[PDB]
Amino acid sequence: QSTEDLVNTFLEKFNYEAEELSYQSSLASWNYNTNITDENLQKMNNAGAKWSAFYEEQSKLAKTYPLEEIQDSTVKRQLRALQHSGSSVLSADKNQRLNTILNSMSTIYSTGKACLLLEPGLDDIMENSKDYNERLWAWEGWRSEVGKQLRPLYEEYVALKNEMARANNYEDYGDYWRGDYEEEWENGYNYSRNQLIDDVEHTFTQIMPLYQHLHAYVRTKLMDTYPSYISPTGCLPAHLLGDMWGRFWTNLYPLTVPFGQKPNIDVTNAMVNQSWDARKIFKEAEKFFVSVGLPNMTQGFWENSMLTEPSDSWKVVCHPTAWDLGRGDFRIKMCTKVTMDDFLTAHHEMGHIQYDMAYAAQPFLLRNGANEGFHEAVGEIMSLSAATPNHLKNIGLLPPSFFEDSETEINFLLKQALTIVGTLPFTYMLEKWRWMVFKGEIPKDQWMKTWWEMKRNIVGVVEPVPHDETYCDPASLFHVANDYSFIRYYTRTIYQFQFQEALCQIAKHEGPLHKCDISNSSEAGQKLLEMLKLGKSKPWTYALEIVVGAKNMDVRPLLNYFEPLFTWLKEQNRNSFVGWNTDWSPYAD
Amino acid sequence: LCPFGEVFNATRFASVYAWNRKRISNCVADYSVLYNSASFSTFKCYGVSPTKLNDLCFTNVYADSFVIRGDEVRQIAPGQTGKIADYNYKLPDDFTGCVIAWNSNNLDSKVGGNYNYLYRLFRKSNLKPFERDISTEIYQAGSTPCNGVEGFNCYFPLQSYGFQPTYGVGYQPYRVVVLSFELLHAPATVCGPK
Ligand SMILES: *[C@@H]1O[C@H](CO)[C@@H](O[C@@H]2O[C@H](CO)[C@@H](O)[C@H](O)[C@H]2NC(C)=O)[C@H](O)[C@H]1NC(C)=O
Ligand SMILES: *[C@@H]1O[C@H](CO)[C@@H](O[C@@H]2O[C@H](CO)[C@@H](O)[C@H](O)[C@H]2NC(C)=O)[C@H](O)[C@H]1NC(C)=O
Ligand SMILES: *[C@@H]1O[C@H](CO)[C@@H](O[C@@H]2O[C@H](CO)[C@@H](O)[C@H](O)[C@H]2NC(C)=O)[C@H](O)[C@H]1NC(C)=O
Ligand SMILES: *[C@@H]1O[C@H](CO)[C@@H](O[C@@H]2O[C@H](CO)[C@@H](O)[C@H](O)[C@H]2NC(C)=O)[C@H](O)[C@H]1NC(C)=O
Ligand SMILES: *[C@@H]1O[C@H](CO)[C@@H](O)[C@H](O)[C@H]1NC(C)=O
Ligand SMILES: [Zn+2]
């Protein structure tokens, strides 16, 4: 008769009534993405609406059970997951206004027009064009046309989100996002929300030196294109960052390459010679994942999955995805080609599929990752281990006479660094700005005067043209125009190397870390599937401590990964000046 | 010469809660045709081996045929616990008989969702060995009963499998037939030569 007794019965019904309404929605969503017609949209919408209505009804009617009497550990957290969802209940009249505001704010970004739509033509100028003037006007124009219409709408958005956060006994909307890492346990495995601000603020100081060096070379390797256009002791302009906003530096590689006479490790020609196809690639990936002790792929995987372009004139999107529809259904959707780039994605998706298969035995509410970064971090180490010279030689796609050169290693390390390390200050800065704005500490009348103040101080990027408060820069990002957390990547970047170091140490590899390999080892995969089977049944502190042996993030493994690049680069700074000055302005010398 | 064949290859099978009973008497037993089926995933015979079937025979034999999932096959055994082993069908500890199961996904699936198979997930107490209950009374969870119709804290006691062709392996439909013997005062008739 106790409350726990009623809770158990209420949960044992939900665990089975959710599994159908989830399966129908998953199948409806998959069929539209597979076939694309004018009639499947209605079915998908109907299934989604039914599932959402069922979930919202159950979440509201599950709030009549107090949590204080629950004794079992996992049973309390199942209701914690069920009850917190649906917290966006503040006012019926205001809900429609908020939804209309969100849709209107998202609409302009989708239908953005600039003389060329965002995807076909606007991206090419920022990604490949090397003309100063062409990018100079384009970067300003994208903000001037699309951005200026988004500023007034964003004013009420923050107020409404703050009111919604204060409805649920929170402080600000940022603290609502910060609740994906909050956990309550014994003295040894507890995490409090306000610590997440501090811990990250630690993990950025130790990366401060290395990034500084990465700011130097590029600065002295972009001098050649523009001899007397940018000062050699100031901040890098935003429009010369290889992207519209500056998230990645990966497209500056042709401008800054140390040794252009040595080609990178490419095996596309060897694949062409031997007449490979998609099934061979996926069988090679299956071999890679089974050699490390993990299980194999089910029978239905090869029959129900789509693994090529449909050449029968039907339209598809076929963006690379992996689907766990539910109840034993696993599929992978990707337009396969015969280049080396898809070889990495083959392992990347199989990692997600294996992680999904790992925790199928847990209750329905616990079938997910430990937090918002584990799921993606698991699938990156497989691509890292599948792109090494040793694996390529062992498989057979590479001649046995191939050797390894120091210049090749340096170039590979710089290529990976320009993609990974360069995105951390930007990711941290955006979240810091958003958190401060949500707190409301920053005055509304000086937002730009504050935003650029961060840009020089943190990431060292200076605007080319002065701007007033009319503009609204952050809305230019897709992840900002739509409500989405932006702190996932910072955690995933650290977690992948944190896992890789431990796995390679268990595999007993001798040599530098970046030349590791985890194949032919049934111990590392066995240890990994120890945490992959947990799912969300235990807090992520236990999941982390099972593998690495600690309780918190450490950035030392990432510094150990780039030790050769750091040491080799350190010599080139002797006849140069490292750092930037917050003293120069575009209008005054 | 009783037709064991029609019991196995029958047109329709029943739900787990309404487990059908077939009584066979005054005939002969032919176990070669059952052994040579080559389509049995599980063939666990408990106290049953072809070595000594030709010296002792029984009087009457009971057969039970139903449809279950793929991962619930292991629960049809003496002493097993779970949901189907205490609310639907229990084997007595002193059980002498055979259990046969086979995959039948090709016949009992529909893209839109087959909803003609049911199972019971709530009850007041465990079922006695070889006991059945098809009660439609609304199961009661809390101390306070509800006036014959459900809604809050009251739950209907039956739920249906939504079989579809593209499920996994442990969720695909399976057909199970259990054969048991009796040793009453009737004349021992079911045993044949050669
Ligand atoms: C996890 O639990 C520990 C339990 O000791 C918390 O430690 C608290 O630390 C503050 C700061 O010194 C003390 O004033 C408290 O007395 C300590 N105990 C408690 C129960 O608060 C710790 O803050 C918790 N959170 C984290 C992230 O470690
Ligand atoms: C695959 O690689 C082999 C490597 O020798 C190629 O072989 C030669 O191809 C030319 C024509 O392109 C022939 O004249 C030669 O006789 C082939 N062999 C030798 C020993 O040189 C081959 O063409 C490549 N492609 C395929 C699909 O076989
Ligand atoms: C995973 O499943 C595959 C089949 O999909 C297994 O592959 C077969 O393994 C047997 C082992 O004796 C070989 O004889 C077959 O030729 C293999 N392929 C096929 C097409 O059946 C595989 O062994 C399974 N798991 C493991 C341990 O890798
Ligand atoms: C139950 O009915 C099926 C009907 O198909 C029987 O299947 C036959 O099996 C024999 C071999 O035992 C084959 O020679 C036939 O071709 C099959 N089909 C036909 C047309 O009958 C099955 O044998 C029957 N059950 C038992 C236990 O005998
Ligand atoms: C998708 O739908 C069209 C129209 O019904 C049909 O012709 C086609 O076979 C379906 N499947 C594929 C592979 O496009
Ligand atoms: Zn991924």
XYZ file of C-alpha atoms in Angstrom, chain A residues 1 6 8-10 12-13 16-17 19-20 23-24 27 61 64-65 298-299 304 326-329 331 360 367, chain B residues 69 83 111-112 115 119 121-122 139 141-143 150 152-156 159-160 162 164 166-169 171:
54
model
C 0.000 0.000 0.000
C 1.823 2.545 -6.508
C 6.041 0.581 -9.429
C 2.649 -0.271 -10.934
C 2.346 3.141 -12.594
C 5.355 -0.846 -15.359
C 2.393 0.303 -17.482
C 5.081 -0.757 -22.280
C 2.645 1.868 -23.488
C 7.179 1.538 -26.706
C 4.464 1.451 -29.391
C 7.885 2.903 -32.644
C 5.088 4.323 -34.795
C 8.758 4.349 -38.511
C -0.734 13.045 -14.350
C 0.597 13.494 -7.859
C 3.269 11.239 -6.306
C 22.000 -8.511 -36.467
C 20.461 -10.166 -39.520
C 16.423 -3.088 -43.840
C 13.102 0.555 -31.051
C 12.483 -3.100 -30.178
C 15.460 -4.611 -31.960
C 15.326 -2.345 -35.027
C 19.361 0.974 -39.285
C 18.818 -2.241 -24.800
C 18.022 4.090 -22.826
C 7.797 -13.872 -27.822
C 5.857 -12.507 -15.888
C 3.043 -3.715 -41.560
C 0.237 -1.755 -39.904
C -3.231 -6.587 -32.607
C -0.982 -11.224 -22.511
C 0.657 -8.453 -16.719
C -1.199 -7.851 -13.424
C -7.192 -4.886 -11.795
C -3.696 -1.261 -7.507
C -4.448 1.040 -4.576
C -6.237 0.286 -1.343
C -10.895 2.369 -14.547
C -6.844 6.956 -12.147
C -4.809 4.404 -10.150
C -6.876 1.569 -11.893
C -5.508 -0.514 -14.845
C -6.964 -2.949 -17.360
C -2.036 -5.770 -23.200
C -1.481 -6.619 -26.857
C 1.981 -5.108 -31.927
C 5.456 -6.230 -37.235
C 10.867 -5.777 -39.034
C 11.366 -6.342 -35.295
C 14.419 -8.020 -33.787
C 14.960 -11.705 -33.036
C 10.641 -9.979 -30.292
